[PDB]
Design a protein around this ligand. Structure first.
Ligand SMILES: C=CC(C)(C)OC[C@H]1O[C@H](O[C@@H]2C3=C(C(C)C)C[C@H](O)[C@]3(C)/C=C3/[C@@H](COC)CC[C@H]3[C@@H](C)[C@H]2O)[C@H](O)[C@@H](O)[C@@H]1O
Ligand SMILES: C=CC(C)(C)OC[C@H]1O[C@H](O[C@@H]2C3=C(C(C)C)C[C@H](O)[C@]3(C)/C=C3/[C@@H](COC)CC[C@H]3[C@@H](C)[C@H]2O)[C@H](O)[C@@H](O)[C@@H]1O
Ligand SMILES: [Mg+2]
Ligand SMILES: [Mg+2]
Ligand SMILES: [Mg+2]
Ligand SMILES: [Mg+2]
Ligand SMILES: [Mg+2]
Ligand SMILES: [Mg+2]
Lengths: 236, 5, 236, 5
């Protein structure tokens, strides 16, 4: 590990600097180094880890979609053959994306999930595990695609079960998990009815729990609830 | 695309 | 060279795909590979080279400025000492930026400039040489800072001299060179009067030559003229 | 910052 010689606190500090500079690749590398120190992450540190990798892989996914679209058009009736280059470059981006997903899943498996006992950490990491299997599923085609989809589903499901037992319906992690699992159902698992049902139930149960919250907790929560509503409007 | 967090 | 095994035409094709995907690091690496094939670049290819590196180093410069600002505040009266980390990370970004500038200057020196005989290629590459020395000057502090500034000035000046002899006043390369040399004067060389004089003369002489142009050439040209006007408005 | 191209 190239971060093995840097203090944990310095890695955290530099991840925050990288976030301010929108240097998400650096941010992710700093937080990988911090995780590899072997200590549990605090609430704030977990968010630095998730945001860094979400942004790295988000950019990869956007680029992959651009290239996959060009590739699909290159294979339509009437398109001039243009050689292997579009496929090759799409594959290059895809392999880099898979590498980042594998790295995140490895951090979760070694050993963030096994040491996470509190609901807010365990649900968080299992959500991330579902998310990174979902990104693998978006580009998957071969013998293991179903296993990749089922790995995403299994991680999201375990997170869901814990979240419903241990967290209030307005908890932002619980809400975000439900949002993303609903998207998994719609876009990955060919289950739009399940996606809609989950988004609606989650929204309605959160609405009914808002009265228990402070102004600041209400602000959080309502923000993710609006994303659930946005997706429902797209889907209905 | 739909929203995720 | 990791691109040594790829066909020149495939590198150009992939640079265009990378541009569409906003993958500027890849775009720059493809175009470095293309330059290293040893053949001159066409007009379109020159633009792919310049846009790729402009965007890579542009992002580095933006990040450097964020970190330099944090660093300067960390060294003001009353600021809590926070250790070496801000300086270290600013230095990391700075060294990466310098590396990219050195790479571009190396391509220009080996051997793009020496083989460029037509005004539109020679001025283009000399402008780039001024630009990348200017970016080195933005972060420079040591014994060689004056030499770095003078290297930028010398490249811009040779480009200026050729542009005025060989190109019409509305030529987009001539205009962009003048825009950037004016910014060099204002931001690097502590010569705001020279910056203003150059921007104004360039604008006025281009205005007087617009009547010779087609609609499409007018559209080009007028676009860079507006940038000259924008800078003049900022400076006066 | 001023504009460059
Ligand atoms: C990089 C860290 C910085 C910029 C400092 O903080 C980012 C955000 O972290 C908090 O929000 C969190 C947060 C988001 C809210 C803005 C909706 C979007 C982020 O993807 C993040 C970190 C992610 C998650 C998901 C993580 O699933 C693994 C589950 C829901 C949500 C939770 C954890 C929210 O609680 C603050 O409450 C916000 O104010 C702040 O903007
Ligand atoms: C990556 C290539 C793609 C996106 C295909 O083209 C980019 C642009 O290239 C042309 O503009 C050029 C161009 C710009 C115009 C949009 C002002 C901004 C770019 O920095 C570029 C390539 C750069 C330069 C400077 C290069 O100094 C070394 C000198 C002026 C200008 C000239 C060369 C303009 O002529 C087209 O005329 C535009 O239509 C088109 O948007
Ligand atoms: Mg230590
Ligand atoms: Mg593949
Ligand atoms: Mg149910
Ligand atoms: Mg060949
Ligand atoms: Mg330095
Ligand atoms: Mg003069």
């Amino acid at each position: 590990g190239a971060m093995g010689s840097m203090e944990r606190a310095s890695l955290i500090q530099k991840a925050k600097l990288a976030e301010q500079a929108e240097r998400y690749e650096d941010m992710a590398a700093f937080m990988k180094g911090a995780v590899e120190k072997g200590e549990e992450l605090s609430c704030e540190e977990r968010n630095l880890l998730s945001v860094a990798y979400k942004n790295v892989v988000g950019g990869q996914r956007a680029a992959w979609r651009v290239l996959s679209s060009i590739e699909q058009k290159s294979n339509e009736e009437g398109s001039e053959e243009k050689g292997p280059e579009v496929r090759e470059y799409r594959e290059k981006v895809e392999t880099e994306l898979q590498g980042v997903c594998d790295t995140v899943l490895g951090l979760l498996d070694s050993h963030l999930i096994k040491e996470a006992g509190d609901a807010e950490s365990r649900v968080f990491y299992l959500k991330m595990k579902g998310d990174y299997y979902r990104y693998l599923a978006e580009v998957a085609t071969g013998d293991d695609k179903k296993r990749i989809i089922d790995s995403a589903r299994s991680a999201y499901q375990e997170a869901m079960d814990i979240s419903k037992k241990e967290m209030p319906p307005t908890n932002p992690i619980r809400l975000g998990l439900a949002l993303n699992f609903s998207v998994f159902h719609y876009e990955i698992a060919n289950s739009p009815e399940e996606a809609i049902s989950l988004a609606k139930t989650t929204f309605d149960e959160a609405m009914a729990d808002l009265h228990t919250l402070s102004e600041d907790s209400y602000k959080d929560s309502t923000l993710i609830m609006q994303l659930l509503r946005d997706n429902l409007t797209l889907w209905t | 695309f739909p929203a995720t967090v």
